[PDB]
Every structure is written in C-alpha cells, then in structure tokens.
Amino acid sequence: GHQQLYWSHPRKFGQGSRSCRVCSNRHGLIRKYGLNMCRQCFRQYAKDIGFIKLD
Amino acid sequence: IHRIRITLTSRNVKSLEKVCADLIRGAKEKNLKVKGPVRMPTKTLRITTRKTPCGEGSKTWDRFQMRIHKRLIDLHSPSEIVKQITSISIEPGVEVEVTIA
Amino acid sequence: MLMPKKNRIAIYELLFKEGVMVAKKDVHMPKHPELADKNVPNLHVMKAMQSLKSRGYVKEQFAWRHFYWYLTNEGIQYLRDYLHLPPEIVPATLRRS
Amino acid sequence: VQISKKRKFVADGIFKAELNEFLTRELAEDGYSGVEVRVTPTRTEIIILATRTQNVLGEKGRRIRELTAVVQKRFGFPEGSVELYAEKVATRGLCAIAQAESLRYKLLGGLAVRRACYGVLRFIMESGAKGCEVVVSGKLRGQRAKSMKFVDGLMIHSGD
Amino acid sequence: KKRKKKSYTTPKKNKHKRKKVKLAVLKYYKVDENGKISRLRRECPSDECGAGVFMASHFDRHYCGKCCLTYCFN
Amino acid sequence: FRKFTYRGVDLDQLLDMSYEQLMQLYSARQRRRLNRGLRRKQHSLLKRLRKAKKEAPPMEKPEVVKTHLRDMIILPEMVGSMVGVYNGKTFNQVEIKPEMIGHYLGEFSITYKPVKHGRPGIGATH
RNA sequence: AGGAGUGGAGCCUGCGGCUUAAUUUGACUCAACACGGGAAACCUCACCCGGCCCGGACACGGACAGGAUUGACAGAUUGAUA
RNA sequence: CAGCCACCCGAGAUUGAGCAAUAACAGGUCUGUGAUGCCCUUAGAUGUCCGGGGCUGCACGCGCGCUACACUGACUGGCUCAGCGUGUGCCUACCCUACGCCGGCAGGCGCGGGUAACCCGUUGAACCCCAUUCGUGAUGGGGAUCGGGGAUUGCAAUUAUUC
C-alpha cells in the first residue's frame, strides 16, 4: 500500500531534500537572502550572483 | 490620483543615474511637473565566507558585499505618458517597480 | 515497473506535446513539476528516461541537480511508433512560433 | 506578490548562473562563449555570443526551439513567450572561455598539450592581444603532476 | 563500499516465484451443465470489477485489495 | 514494610479519574499531543497490547511484543504487563511496575557504548 | 617600556590513549586542536545495526502469455493497517 | 640631494582593507562537488521509499576561550544615548512583530503595520550616570554542583538538551 503511503512523514525542518541547490552536497548551507548553496558553489559562482569584493 | 511612482533599483550607480537622467529628460521633453530623484539608502549586503573548502590553514575569509542603489521618481502624470517615455531601451540590470495610487 | 503501460504511453503523449522538458533529481518526490497531480511519479520519470538511455536514442545535459532531456529523430520516431499514432502531433511551439 | 530588492537581485543572479552553467556544459562543443539577458515589457530576450554560431543555432532554428523548450520548463517561462538570439564573437582574443573550450576540445580529440597551447598562443598574439597565460596542470605524461605555463607577452598581475 | 556480511539468515531480496497450471479457473466453475452461474463469489461494488474479477472469502475476515471493502461473515 | 504510592492514587484511580486533575498529576509530558492530535499509522499498537493482555498464561509472563516504533502513550493501561522494547539490534524484556506511570516508554531504552578498554601505552608518551 | 592575560579556577564539536557491539573521523611544529563555517529526536549518521525496496533498465537466449503491485479493526504478531 | 625631525594654518600633515609578482610545494581537502584512476563494489546497492541507538562514553598533561576571586565593586532603582544590519516564502508552517482579555515563565484570537528610511524605530533600549540591606565573608563577589511545575515554534527533548 505504498502508493497511498508514500511520503507519509513530512520532513519540513530538515534540509536533506532542501540542500545546496547545485549538487548532492551539504555541510555548510547558508540561507542568507535564500541562497540555498554551500560555500563551495557560492564562492566559485559569486561572480554571477552580483557579490563583489571591495571591502 | 495620477501620481505615478517609479521605484527603480540597480546594482550600478552610474547606470542608475543615466536611467534617471534619461527618464527625467523624457519627462522634461513633455509638459509634466516632476520631483527630483529621491535616493533611498543603498542596501549593503554582507556575506563573509570561509575560503578554504575544507578547514585548514589560517582563518581566511572573503567578504562579498552587494550594493543595491534605489531611486524613486514620482511624477504628476498618467502612467501612459510615463510608459511612452519608457520605451527607450532601459539599461540592463535596472529594475522598475510601478506604483499607482 | 509494477506500473501500467497505459500510463507510460500517457507520459509519451505528454512529452510529445513538446520536444524536451526537465526533470527534478529526486526519487521521493510524489508528483511531477510539469505533470502536477496526474499520478506520474518522478522516480518513474527518470526510469523512463534511463530506459531510453539504455536504448540509445535519448541523452541528457544534467545540471544543478536537474536532468535535461534530449531527443533525436530516431527517438522521436520510436515514440511516435509506440504511441500507435500519426506523426501529425508536432510540438505546439511551432504552432506558436 | 512583490519581493525585496536583495532577494530579487539574488534570484536574478541565481538564474544567470544557472543559464551560464547549463549552456557551458551543453554547448561547449558548439563553442558557446557567453549569455546576456535583456527585458522588454512582458518579454525576456537572451542573446548568446558563440564562436560557432552556425553550430549554436542549428538547422531552421530547430535546436533553438529545442533550447527554449528546455529553459521554459526549468525557470518558469510560459510556453511560446521566450526567444533565443546569438551573435558571433567579435574576436576570440577578448574572451578567455572561448580559447578555454577550444583547448578542451582540442585535447579531448587527442593531441599533444604543447601543440595546442602554442597554437592558442600564436592565435592570441596574431589577434593584437597584449598578453596570454595558459597554465596547464595535471599529468601530461607518466604518473606525476607537473604544472606547465605557456606565457607570452607582458601581463598585469595585481591591482584594480 | 565494504561487505555487510549477509551470512546468518537468508541473504535474499528476490521476489516470489511460483509454479501452477496454465488453465487456472477460480472465477468460474466448469463441468456444471449450466449456462448460468450460481453466485458464490461476492458482489464487488467497485467500478473496477467486471465478470472476470471477483474475490474469495475465507473464514477469517473478508479479503480485499482493490477498493478496501468488507463482506464479513466470521 | 516500606510504603510506596503514586501521590494518593493508583492505576485504578487514574483510570477512574478524568484527565482534568490528571494534567495536575502530569509532570509536563504527553499533554500537547491532545491539542496537536494523533496522526495515521497509530491505531494498531494499542490493539496489539490489549489483545496480548487479554490472554495471560498461568504462572507465565505476558507474551513478548516486538515493537519497532516509539509510540507515545496517553493512558496507564500498559501497567500490569510486560513489554519487549527496542535496544538497537535485539528486543529487551521489561517488567512494568508503578514507575511506568509518570514516565514515558522510550525512557526505558538506554543504549550507549564505549569503544574498548585501554591505557596510555607505548604509542602515547607526552 | 609596557598593555585583557589566556597559563592559575568546577562547566566546550573536537583532539590522546580512556567501563556492556557504534562515542568512533580528516587535519602532530605555529601555518591541525571554537578548524572542516560542527550545541545532532529525526536527514547533524563517516559509525555493530533491527533491514522496511530495487529508484537491476535494458542488446541476445526463458517453464517463452499467467512472475506482481495498490491485501487497513482480524487468528495473521520479527512494521503490526507492506 | 633623496630624504628625516620640529612649527603655524588646516577638517585632514601615516584613516582601514580587497586586489598582491616570477616560480613552487609531493602542506589539507577524493568525508565540498552530476570534475575524476586497475582492487572490495559484478545488484550481496556503508544513508538511499520507511527510518525506532552512533563523534550524546571517565582517572589526568599548560589546545582558541567562559564567568570570577571583589568595596574603581555584584548589588532595590532613579534617570535615560546607539550603529551595520536581519525581516510573510520555489515540495518554505516557520519572518519581524504596534493593543483588549488572561496568563510572573513561553503564549490563544482579533482589528492589521511591513517589501520594505513607509511597520515596529526615535533599535525610548542595551555599558555607565551609584538614593537598598552590603564591610572581608561561604550570606548578597563565586547558580558552580538538588526535585518538582507552566509549556511555544518540535509526531519523536530519554544526558530537567534549548523558554
């Protein structure tokens, strides 16, 4: 009866399925302004986001 | 009321000012009483990220800062005239929010 | 797949309404973003795509945890054959081109 | 339904990065060299500079119809309201990713690293460019990682 | 990845495999000299059962698996 | 000889007593599940424990119950029997006594463990 | 010349060896030891496990066309309402 | 001479940081990655649908740090001054959060305020502004060491983990 039993428990607090939006990676997710990436993808892809370094 | 408000926001100050000058000239090309561009405080967004992908070495961080500059142009005119002025090949990266009340 | 063939042909028809869409990389997602509330499991969507990958008439351009479908003329021919339907159903985008 | 300026600008950046990655991994063989986005009232246009425009457009524009068929189903573009454009790159010596992909698909075809690097060097300095650095690291041959540099002309290394 | 050492109980995830007759008639009865059928198979109110799909009732509860009904005669 | 009670009430009284002053007897636990409500997949454990409790062998303990779910329990009907609770790879056997009320079933599952025994030896000097 | 002074006092993710299978990792000279953006019911899980399911699909040969799933008040108990 | 040290005017006579070379390491990361090299992995699939323990252990060595040892002070409370920011939303309830009733403790419904310098905001704040027992102690420096109870985001607080 898995067809009506599929996805029984709503996992809403966890980010297993809400991990970094790029790939199958975790351990360092940041939700500043809703990035939903880890540090790796953000830093390598920060040139297209619009975040620049002049501090 | 016919006070049309453009909440125009962009990442570049120079492109923003060129857009504002072109818009206020197009208003100045017609008979429209206008206010000067109102510069709301730019949003400075800070993201401080560790540089080494795996924790090793000296504690080193990048500080990515995002400067968001926003002007408002509220002119006493029907929005159709402002839209007639609008078709001027708006600068990329400058977004327009239309407020009519 | 313990899944009826009629639903597989329904998936073929829904794809044939277009030429290529994208798939969400997940097997626990009950539904399909494009085929929302049509009893189309995402895991079986990638099952279908992996089957035609085994056939060798389709490919993918996976990016950002998202499968990117492909379709070659032989693959379109095979889908128009197994649908048991005329090739007259060309993608509607050319009717809106 | 309005959203804050920071979030909308980060969404635009996310969208642009997504297009960049997808088109770089999808059309690298066809010499994809850059994506730009423009907006008109209730219309989004995307212009794609490419080294191989005949290979980025396709026959009758069909691939473009395919391409828009893909993007429209990912980022939320309603059917039939998005168009894709392409312009030839003015020079291959003003963009680095073009020669990068050229090096990829010259070595992937089977070729000594040095020959391709020197071909790129002479192509660049017959383009009037003032300096080119191609650093290649890995295992050129054998089982050891040696980093080689193909350095031509002066090149600024610091500052604004 | 390394071995998890299925060595004590059955190391089998395979499904069931059964042998039976080619002509298995359990929805009807034959050798009856009757063109009609005396209805010993329970009437199924689901709109998925015709004359080729019925159910068999045991001493324990009423079995289902199509629409989750109950015809209980325990 | 020594006197033990549950603050003037027993399982029988608490069965007769309604939840009104039971909440006053409740420490802090298992109260908001009523306001939250009970979900699906949660109707068989009570039936199974009651069915086991109905038939109790003479001079023998109630039959072992294999449970893989940590089920929140709202009533003291469990007290007076035995439970086979989860350890991690086996099912450990528990006698129920008046300490069960005032506590949760999951509080009897204590499982934590060291690596091995040793002292700082040849390898570790400083 | 001098300055919170951490070193000296009981409370930290983690260090190095430290009770009943899992307290486990990568980083021994700062430039590893509040570091891997690290306070963990669950996904904080890299770890004996109790295994709920194939998300083994398909060229070529099958007892080749009667293999299975959606069986939930059940006695059916090792997920009982698979 | 390049320059160094004093002085008057002056807002300012060294404001702080990101960019940082040629060339290289056998320094860490295959446990960051849909970037990857023969061995266990050939479906006997070190999480994968469901998910009920695990880096959540005790004898000690100067590993970043934590509140203090007190009267320049914790302490009834009087008066009143902040700046970067963060903020209702794609399988994103949950974000800040102006009153009536109640409830010391967290919080129930409403009229609304907020995509934003419009809403909290005049961050009335917060350190200090010294009128209260305090006097050299085990009480008030030092909650660091006990058992009960209201309970909001949390099916699942078992090492009252966290109010």
Whether F85 contacts F105, CB under 8 Å? yes
- Give the Cα separation of F55 and F107 in Å (integer): 27
Instruction: Give the CA-to-C1' distance from A50 to H14 in angstroms.
Output: 34
E6 touches strand H (CB under 7 A): yes
- Give the Cα separation of C31 and C50 in Å (integer): 18
Q: In what order do the strands lie in the sheet with B3-10?
A: B38-50, B61-76, B3-10, B94-99
Instruction: Say if the Cβ atoms of D18 and C64 lie within 8 Å.
Output: yes
Which nucleotides in chain H lie closer than 7 A to a protein CB?
16-29, 31-35, 40-41, 43-57, 59-61, 84-93, 115-118, 148-151, 154-160
- Give the Cα separation of B4 and B30 in Å (integer): 15
Amino acid at F67: T
Let me know if domain A1-55 sits in CATH 1.10.3720.10. Answer: no
- Give the Cα separation of A30 and A23 in Å (integer): 14
Q: Which CATH architecture has domain B1-101?
A: 2-Layer Sandwich (3.30)
- Within 10 angstroms of residue C25's Cβ, the number of other Cβ atoms is 16
A52 touches chain D (CB under 8 A): no
Option in A33, A34, A45 nearest D17 (CB): A45
Residue D3 is part of a domain; what is its CATH number? 3.30.300.20
Q: In what order do the strands lie in the sheet with D82-88?
A: D32-40, D43-50, D82-88
- Structure tokens given for D62: 């069909």
Extents of the domains making up chain A: 1-55
Backbone torsions φ then ψ of D118, nearest 5 degrees? -70, -35
Whether C27 contacts C42, CB under 8 Å? yes
- Give the Cα separation of D134 and D152 in Å (integer): 9
Strands D132-136 and D82-88: unpaired
- Give the Cα separation of F63 and F66 in Å (integer): 10
User: Which residues in D lie closer than 8 A to residue A34 (C-beta atoms)?
Assistant: 7, 10-11
Task: Let me know the angle formed at the C-alpha of B14 by B13 and B18, rounded to the nearest 5 degrees.
Answer: 115
Which chain D residues in 10-29 lie under 8 Å from chain A, judged by CB atoms? 10-14, 16-17, 20-21
Instruction: Say if the Cβ atoms of C28 and A17 lie within 8 Å.
Output: yes
Question: Cα torsion for F74, F78, F84, F87, to the nearest 10°?
Answer: 30
Let me know if domain C3-97 sits in CATH 1.10.10.10. Answer: yes
Extents of the domains making up chain F: 4-123
What DSSP assignment string belongs to A1-55?
-HHHHTT-S---S--SSSS-SSSS--SS-B-GGG--B-HHHHHHTHHHHT-B---
Experimental method: cryo-EM
Q: What is the DSSP letter of C69?
A: B
Resolution (Å) of this entry: 2.7
Q: Do chains C and F touch (3 or more CB pairs under 8 A)?
A: no
> 3-state DSSP call for residue D68?
helix
What DSSP assignment string belongs to D109-155?
T---HHHHHHHHHHHHHTTT-S-EEEEE-S-SSTTS---EEEEES--
- Give the Cα separation of C12 and C18 in Å (integer): 10
Beta bridge partners of D151: D133
- Structure tokens given for E1: 């990845």
- Give the Cα separation of F15 and F7 in Å (integer): 15
User: Which residues in C lie closer than 8 A to residue A6 (C-beta atoms)?
Assistant: 30
F65 touches strand G (CB under 7 A): yes
- Give the Cα separation of B63 and E7 in Å (integer): 55
Contact residues for D142 (Cβ-Cβ < 8 A; gap 6+)? none
Contact residues for F33 (Cβ-Cβ < 8 A; gap 6+)? F72, F74
Nearest chain D residue to B8 by CA: give it: D5
Helix (H) or strand (E) holding B48: strand B38-50
User: Which residues in D lie closer than 8 A to residue C19 (C-beta atoms)?
Assistant: 65-66, 69
CA atoms within 13 A on the CB side of F28: 0
- Residues of the domain holding D34: 1-90
Whether B93 contacts B1, CB under 8 Å? no
Option in A7, A23, A24 nearest C30 (CB): A7
Q: How many Å separate Cα B74 from the centre of its chain?
A: 14
Instruction: Say if the Cβ atoms of C26 and A21 lie within 8 Å.
Output: no
Contact residues for C45 (Cβ-Cβ < 8 A; gap 6+)? C11, C23, C32
**Nearest nt by C1' to F63 Cα:** G77
CA dist list (Å): B63 to A42, A53, B42, B68? 12, 6, 18, 16
Whether A22 contacts D17, CB under 8 Å? no
Residues of chain E with a following break (C to N over 2.5 Å):
none
- Give the Cα separation of D106 and D99 in Å (integer): 10
- Give the Cα separation of C3 and C9 in Å (integer): 11
Contact residues for D97 (Cβ-Cβ < 8 A; gap 6+)? D24, D33, D34
Whether D65 contacts C91, CB under 8 Å? yes
Contact residues for E40 (Cβ-Cβ < 8 A; gap 6+)? none
- Give the Cα separation of A29 and E48 in Å (integer): 49
Whether B45 contacts A51, CB under 8 Å? yes
Radius of gyration of chain C (CA): 13
C28 touches chain A (CB under 8 A): yes
Whether D120 contacts D102, CB under 8 Å? yes
The minimum CA-CA distance between B48 and chain A, rounded to whole Å, is: 10
